[PDB]
Amino acid sequence: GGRCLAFHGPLMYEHYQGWKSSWDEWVGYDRIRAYNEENIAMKKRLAN
Amino acid sequence: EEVTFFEKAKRYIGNKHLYTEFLKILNLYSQDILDLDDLVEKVDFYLGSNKELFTWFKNFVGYQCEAFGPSYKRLPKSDTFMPCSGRDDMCWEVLNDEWVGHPVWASEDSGFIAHRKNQYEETLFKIEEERHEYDFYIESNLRTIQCLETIVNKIENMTENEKANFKLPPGLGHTSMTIYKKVIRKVYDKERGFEIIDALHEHPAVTAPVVLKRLKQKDEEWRRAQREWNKVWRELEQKVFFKSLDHLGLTFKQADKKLLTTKQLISEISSIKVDQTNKKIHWLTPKPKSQLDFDFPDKNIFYDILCLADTFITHTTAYSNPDKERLKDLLKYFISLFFSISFEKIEESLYSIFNLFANTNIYIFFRHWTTIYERLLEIKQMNERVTKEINTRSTVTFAKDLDLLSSQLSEMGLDFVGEDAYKQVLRLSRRLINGDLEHQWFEESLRQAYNNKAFKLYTIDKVTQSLVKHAHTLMTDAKTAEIMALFVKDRNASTTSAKDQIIYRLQVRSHMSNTENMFRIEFDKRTLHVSIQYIALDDLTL
Amino acid sequence: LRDNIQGITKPAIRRLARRGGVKRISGLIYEETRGVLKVFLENVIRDAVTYTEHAKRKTVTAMDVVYALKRQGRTLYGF
Amino acid sequence: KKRPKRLSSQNVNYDLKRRKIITSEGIERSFKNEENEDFCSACNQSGSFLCCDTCPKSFHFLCLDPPIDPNNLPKGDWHCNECKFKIFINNSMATLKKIESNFIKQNNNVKIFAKLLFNIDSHNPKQFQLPNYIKETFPAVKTGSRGQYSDENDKIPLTDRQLFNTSYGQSITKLDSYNPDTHIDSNSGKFLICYKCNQTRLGSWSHPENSRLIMTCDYCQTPWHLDCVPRASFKNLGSKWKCPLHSPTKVYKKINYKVWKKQRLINKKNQLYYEPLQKIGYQNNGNIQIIPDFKITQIDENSIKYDFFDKIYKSKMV
Amino acid sequence: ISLQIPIKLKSVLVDDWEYVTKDKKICRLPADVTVEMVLNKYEHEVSQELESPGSQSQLSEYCAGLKLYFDKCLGNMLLYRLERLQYDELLKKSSKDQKPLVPIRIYGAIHLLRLISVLPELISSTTMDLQSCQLLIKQTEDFLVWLLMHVDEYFNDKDPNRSDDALYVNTSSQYEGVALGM
Amino acid sequence: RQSTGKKPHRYRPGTVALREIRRYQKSTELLIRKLPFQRLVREIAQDFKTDLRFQSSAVMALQEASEAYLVALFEDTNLAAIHAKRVTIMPKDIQLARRIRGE
Amino acid sequence: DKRRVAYFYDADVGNYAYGAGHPMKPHRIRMAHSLIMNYGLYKKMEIYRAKPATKQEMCQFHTDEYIDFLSRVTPDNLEMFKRESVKFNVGDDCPVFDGLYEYCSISGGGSMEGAARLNRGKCDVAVNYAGGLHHAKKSEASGFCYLNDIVLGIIELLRYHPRVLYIDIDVHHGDGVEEAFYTTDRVMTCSFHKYGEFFPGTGELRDIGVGAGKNYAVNVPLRDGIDDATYRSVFEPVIKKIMEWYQPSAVVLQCGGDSLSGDRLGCFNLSMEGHANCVNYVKSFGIPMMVVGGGGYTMRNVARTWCFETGLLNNVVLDKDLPYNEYYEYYGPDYKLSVRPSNMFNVNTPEYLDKVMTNIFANLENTKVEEDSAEAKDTKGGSQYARD
Ligand SMILES: [Zn+2]
């Protein structure tokens, strides 16, 4: 349900979206959203 | 047992999401929101099967309004205010103006779907419209011709002075006012039709004779066209209608291929196995050993699939001569050995408890055998009525005089009259296996031979080929051939039950691999009863 | 048989342009290419239909298609 | 051996198609010579359309500010509201220099709304449409094809492939033909066990009548037989098939009455506020969730069982 | 320019959208409470609640502006295509009665909530002064929390299928066919 | 009738297009699928004459001839595109090529 | 035992066709009547021709505007006639044809004439094959049905009889009659049809009426391919229980071939015997019964089954031989009076039917101008030359 529900940084989850199939990982650790880590730190500080 | 009721419900539900929804419903009841009736309805689908738990819940809770269905919403009283001059007090007290149903609300703004029909049914409906509009125009013209003939008869016996002035209201002195209007509008033009209608109405006995003549010749040519179309309609519908009546039989050619496979029968026996096991887990710890049983009341049916089998042996060309000979010998021997029949008593002219532990190929072979047996029982049980109906087929004399009876299958000898239907369909199956029957004609013969009830014999050659190919694997496979040899050693027709079948099971479990399926087929000499038990992965766990 | 002009898919036209060395393919080229192919087929198949009707045959052979391509200066080899 | 070539006659051709009989043979000598658009960009729906001569926008007969009826439609040229504002007065003559401030100066200092009142005339009439920020706080709802309400209760429309050309046996229906694929789920390949009776009831191909139809729930994927719950056929068109085991949207408690049309969920932003403090006697009127402004609580099985036992132990005396 | 609405009013608006488009239920126009007495009660409550520092002039100005703008905006951005037939026959009845109908006498507060919902689009599409815009926003939030203080007596959930009053009536087949059809 | 209804590769445009040009120019196999072209051929032929059949080899010859003609037309269209100081083809270039060809 | 049967025919009821490629067709009634007179049933029967209804006589359930609209319906000026087209939902699902006013008038006249003949005691069984329309609402036309003449017949029966029962046995059940009699207690409606993505979409086990009409609307949802045995098992005991509890004074039966094996939009697998034994069972009670016909998109099967209904109502067993009529080419290659059942799947399980029966039993256990008004005036019409 919904359109944004991910334990990692959200990528319109309804698995790493927008990447190949050889990158999946389903191990168990702590989860934090943080709004995609402040939107990858305001897009790497606006491309540094 | 109030303390242990909740975990009992938790183990009964199993799923976590359904348990949370049950807790939400139960708390909704707890917060003075849900009354007793809706709780009773909820536990009717929740714990309806558990009779002990439901009776305890009813005794412990203390159980001793309108339905308001999804349709017929209540209109406001503003829409009720309508004059409705044809309504008296009884109509006011018997009719409701505040309840209206509209199918788009039932569709929830998504529409509705119609029933899917076969293509032959669509051509049959097209034939129905083509035949309908022809004679509908014909008899509308006939009614207008009759009205104009009554008019002409009234003109025939009075003078010219009242002939010049014969003003009439719309209707031509009859109870209808628009049949003739539609007839003249269809015969003539759109703009000219209104003016000739106006002429006929205000000035009769001048345009009316030529209108009657035009309508008479139009009716004559329409009747000639209908007569020349009726023959084509009859002969095309002779092959359209019976194919349209067959719904499952048209798809049977592919359904029998897709559904009579190994994995489908594995699924359909494992479904019954898990149903029996969890039903007993709910009810009682012991489990029955009988499931998917077949009854064998007739002994000549084995002889019938024997005849079909050795007819198929002499037809195919993909096998060698000694391979065909050993396949026919194995097919005869397995029937003579499993069913305790000494030999074949049909080997002259007019031809051309015990436990079985087997693998999956023998399972599929036996399932094909029992399927053909059940099909032949469905043929034979109604055969005494079908043969009586065919032998007493009272043909219509008027159809014979006009040559209207269906003689499509009677020319090539596909008719079932004057002979037994079962022997005739056995010969038809033999020749269809021989490959010189033009199979769709055999489908048509089955369609108008048993009134579409013989739809399971449509792929008799296909299931015979599947049976032959599955019996071919009984000797080529080393494990299956060794299983047959161990059945030669095991079968002795002596009272030695319940002392060596455990050894049979042990040597089979040591003989078969882990991925191979496990079966127990029990056959009884009395009443020819057979039972199959699915014991897959129930012996290698220890 | 209806809506069979869409059987020639958009990546099929894209691959056909790739065979021709086309760098970039517009979104409006697909309908125009489908129309051009429809006109060419409506000429060639009609010519083959006339060729088959002349020979009192009910199905059209590849030789009649070869003749229909040859008569318009587009001769085809291998059939 | 059908013959539609010679036995199809000359007077009457293929039915449902007229011919030249009503035109060529119709001589009666008995009288003895005596820019626009087609999408309706005010409600995004279809129907009878009216358009302006010099404006590409087309409207409905009722979506117009003063709804007009087709039986008394005005004659001559018709114009929209901004057509009266742009091609007509206040733009071509008497150009807009300070008439907007004159609206405040004339309409008795309504300046906080006079600009919107003036912009009303420079605005086409349209149906109500929910704003974007109103829609974003409810992620379960969405806009439909023509602009109707669409929450998770309503099922997605079926495509034409599954509905028209879905072969014969299938026919978008499992009531016809043996359909063993409906009893097997593709997630694990196991058997779908019904909730009421714990049987899949697949049956056999030799006995198709012993098979019982089953369906998958659209929320929790719970299998359910068609004979246990009272229901005739499947649910493919319309709303999603809600099994009678979840929380209903609206319940009735006659005592006039209370409806309680749920809360339809709030997204994972700061509006969703959690506060688990009390487990007994909260009177939270529902909208709970289970864990191992719109106020919600982290309730569990123990608290629900406690308040249930408390309420039915107070209510058994009455 | 950003405006906030409490989640109860957003849920009410979403339920109204569901009633109109999905459930096919228009609002009960012959209702007990209309927009004029809504604004009159709001103005009286805020006038008798606080002191008198000179804000009653702008309070009455805001009330009169909201009344006039709801009068001349009701057929522009509110009024779903389903309710257009109801508006048409009410206008026909008023034309037969030789009287000039204004929407503040018959329309409920749900259309006012719709107007407050579409207000940021109207402010963003118009050239307005900053201080007047903030004053209008502040008065909007004041009215929104006043409506939040009186939800129970004003927006009560009731079903028209079994009650005489639900501030909502069911649409007929003829009504739906005329409105959502031609 | 009774119914109510980390960084990705991120290839720039043009390089993969030239890669496909080099792959399909040296290739041999047919780009257009068999049955869609066959169904289009039958649909076109049914407008001229009904109850008509095509053999597999006739469909093959028609498909290869149409592919070669469309490849030549696309070559002329691309040549006109570079001639018009462009790398993107337009349908007006196709119409111009057809007009120059005389068809 | 022996009962007099009044047959109501009109020679003008079949002269109107709805359109090309149309499911509904009044042309089947003419060949059904030709089958009736071709079987020699006129010697033990009485036949009258009913007059067409008027505007006021058709206003007895519908509104004034709907009746005026239907009287002023004309296909030539359909271009400007678009407001009332919708609302009365005419022209979208029910297209406009010439003679709609006349066809509705004949159907209504036949319906209330059957009701009046049942009321006055002149006949025991009233058969009106000219009109059996049941999908018509108060101001809505659906299912190619325009005027709800069955409601008018029930009203005319209620003028003399205290209780009237309506029985529907075909698919696409009449929601108009149930809507007209949802709240009244003197009218009980029982119907058998398919539910689930079906054109009407109305009728549940929970749908039994509201107010004073609580538990007075019986609806039996069925599935595809129901055979004759399961149809008998779902019909006869519930009909006996309805007669035991409700005790009606009149029965309105909507016979039709929509529930037959071959149909256009139908879904059932009933033969002629399965469709006829229910009528025989409801005739064996002895109480008066009204028979109307408004179903059956097929034609050849519906004519044979209407002839079989007439023959069973005539207390005679019809032979399988089919004589010569002017509509003889419609029939199958066997040319016998027999509707052949199809072999499609019988998905109607006995357990689901038993659950429906228990729900119905638990619902029904609590049941224990105007110058020419009242009708009772028809032309004789004894000179019929339909025999061939
Ligand atoms: Zn129907």
Asked if G33 contacts G9 with a C-beta cutoff of 8 angstroms, the reply is yes
- Mode of pairing for the β-strands spanning D298-299 and D289-290: parallel
Q: Is D47 left (phi over 0), alpha (psi -120 to 50) or beta?
A: left
Chains that touch C (3 or more CB pairs under 8 A): F
Distance from C-alpha of G336 to C-alpha of G340, rounded to nearest angstrom: 10
Cβ contact, residue pair C16, F49, below 8 Å: no
Which residue in the block uniquely carries the two structure tokens 């469905």? B378
**Residue in G82, G92, G140 nearest the CB of E174:** G140
Residue B213, number of CB atoms within 10 A of its CB: 11
Three-class SS of B412-461? CCCCCCCCCHHHHHHHHHHHHHHCCCCCHHHHHHHHCCCCCCCHHHCCHH
**What angle (nearest 5°) sits at the alpha carbon of residue G147, between those of residues G141 and G151?**
115
D227, D232, D237 member nearest G194 (Cβ): D232
Q: Mutating which of F25, F32, F79, F85 best tests the C interface, going by the most C Cβ atoms within 10 A?
A: F32
CATH number, domain G5-379, options 3.30.300.30, 3.40.800.20, 2.60.40.2700, 3.40.50.170: 3.40.800.20
DSSP string, G27-52: HHHHHHHHHHHHTTGGGG-EEEBPPP
Catalytic machinery residues of G: 135
Burial class for G143, CB neighbours closer than 10 Å (0-12, 13-18, 19+): buried
Residue E166: give the domain boundaries: 1-182
| DSSP letters spanning G175-203 | HHHHHHTSS-SSEEEEEEEE-SS-SS---
Helices vs. strands in chain G: H and E counts, helices first: 9, 8
Stated in angstroms to one decimal place, the resolution of this structure is: 2.9
Min Cα separation F5/chain G (Å) = 10
Short-list D224, G354, D242, CA closest to B49: D224
Cβ neighbour number for residue B220 with a 10 Å cutoff: 12
Q: At what angle are helices B460-476 and B300-313 packed, to 10 degrees?
A: 80
Technique behind this structure? cryo-EM
CA angle G277–G23–G37, rounded 5-degree value: 50
CA distance B364 to E135: 84
Q: Where are the domains of chain G?
A: 5-379
Could you give the CA distance from residue B34 to residue B529 in angstroms, rounded to a whole number? Answer: 54
User: Residue D224 Cα, ligand 1 centroid: separation in angstroms?
Assistant: 29
* Residue C14 to residue C17: CA distance in whole angstroms: 5
CA angle B313, B317, B322 (to 5 degrees): 60
Counting CB pairs under 8 A, whether chains F and E reach 3 or more, is no
For ligand 1, a single-atom ion, which residues have Cβ within 5 Å? G 172, 258
* Interatomic CA distance for residues G216 and G178, integer angstroms: 10
- In chain D, how many H helices and how many E strands? 6, 10
Q: Which position has the token pair 């005869």?
A: B332
Contact (CB, 8 A) for G373 and G251: no
CA-wise closest residue to D232 among G342, B45, G193: G193
Tokens linked to B261? 């496979």
Per-domain boundaries in chain C: 1-79
Domain spanning C1-79, CATH architecture: Orthogonal Bundle (1.10)
Nearest to G223 among D71, D175, D230 (CB): D175
Interchain contact, F1 vs G23, CB within 8 Å: yes
The secondary structure of B325-363 as a DSSP string is HHHHHHHHHHHHHHS---S-TT-SSS---EEE---HHHH
Q: Please work out, in degrees rounded to the nearest 5, the angle formed at the alpha carbon of residue B321 by the alpha carbons of B317 and B327.
A: 90
G and B adjacent (3 or more CB pairs under 8 angstroms): yes
DSSP element (H, E) containing D101: helix D99-106
Question: Strand pairing of D142-143 and D149-150?
Answer: antiparallel
Contact A4 D152 (CB under 8 A): no
Contact (CB<8Å) G82/E182: yes
Q: Quick check: D127 and E11 CB within 8 A? A: no
Cα nearest neighbour of E181 on chain G: G86
Yes or no, beta carbons of G85 and E182 under 8 Å apart? yes
Q: Which 3 state secondary structure label does DSSP give B228?
A: helix
DSSP β-ladder status, G217-222 and G187-194 = parallel
Total domains, chain E: 1
Give yes or no for G137 touching E (CB within 8 A).
yes
Cβ–Cβ below 8 Å for E160 and B76: yes
- Cβ–Cβ below 8 Å for A4 and D268: yes
Name the residue among G358, C64, G76, G39 with its Cα closest to residue B193. G76
Q: What residues pair up with B340 in beta bridges, in sequence order?
A: none
> Rg for chain F (alpha carbons), in Å?
20
Please give the structure tokens belonging to residue D263: 């809360």
Taking only residues 68 to 87 of chain F, the set having a beta carbon closer than 8 angstroms to any beta carbon of chain C reads: 68-75, 77-78, 81, 87
For residues G258 and G200, what is the distance between their CA atoms, to the nearest angstrom? 14
Segments of E83-151 assigned E as strands: none
**Strand D58-59 relative to strand D142-143, pairing:** unpaired
Contacts of E182 in chain D (CB under 8 A): 47-48, 61, 70
Q: Is B78 helix (H, G, I), strand (E, B) or coil?
A: helix
**DSSP-derived pairing of the beta strands D149-150 and E169-170:** unpaired
Interface of G with E in 76-115 (CB under 8 A): 82-83, 85-89, 92
Q: Between helices D111-121 and E56-73, what is the axis angle to 10°?
A: 10
Spatial distance between the Cα atoms of E18 and D149, rounded to a whole number of angstroms: 5
Q: Are G26 and G134 in contact (CB under 8 A)?
A: no
| Residue G84 burial class via C-beta count within 10 angstroms: exposed 0-12, middle 13-18, buried 19 and up | buried
First to last CA, chain D: 84
Q: C-alpha B392: how far from its chain's center?
A: 27
The alpha-carbon radius of gyration of chain E (Å, integer) is: 17
Spacing of C-alpha B125 from chain mean position:
20
- The one-letter code for the residue type at G285 is F
d(Cα G167, Cα G239) in Å, to the nearest integer? 9
E strands along chain G, which residues? 5-8, 46-48, 125-128, 164-168, 187-194, 217-222, 250-256, 289-295
Listed by number, the residues of chain C in 16-55 with a beta carbon closer than 8 Å to a beta carbon of chain F are 16-26, 28-29, 31-33, 36-38, 40-42, 44-46, 48-49, 52-53
Q: Which two tokens stand for residue B445?
A: 């013969």
End-to-end CA distance of chain C: 27
